[PDB]
């Protein structure tokens, strides 16, 4: 069933962030993505059986992060990147590097 924009606004009005987050991600589409810690992109190749993590472009095998995001957000980022635009996800504590 459609949990539209009006419903989201009503839940923001009430002030219940946890219900919103659970409805949005855990109940519809949750996805786990490995991102590079230098270029902040989703180009990291991960072999989970051998836990081999590699970033080909930046020659990175250490700074690699796990992020929980929806699947439509991943699709949007890929479609943005297919037109020569770079949505570069960054982490809170990545300013040290």
């Amino acid at each position: 069933l459609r949990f539209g924009e009006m419903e989201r606004d009503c839940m923001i009005a009430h002030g219940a962030a946890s219900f919103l987050k659970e409805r949005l991600m855990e109940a519809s589409d949750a996805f786990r993505v490995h991102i590079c810690g230098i270029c902040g992109l989703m180009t990291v190749i991960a072999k989970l059986n051998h836990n081999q993590f590699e970033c080909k472009g930046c020659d990175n095998k250490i700074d690699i992060y796990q992020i929980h995001i929806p699947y439509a957000a991943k699709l949007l980022f890929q479609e943005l990147m297919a037109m020569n635009i770079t949505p570069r996800l960054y982490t809170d504590r990545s300013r040290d590097f």
Partner: peptide, 18 residues
């Protein structure tokens, strides 16, 4: 009308106290 079910304890407390 539409019915939505919470799936945790924090969510249940939010629905019961807010």
């Amino acid at each position: 009308m539409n019915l939505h079910v919470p799936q945790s304890e924090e969510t249940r407390a939010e629905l019961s106290q807010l």
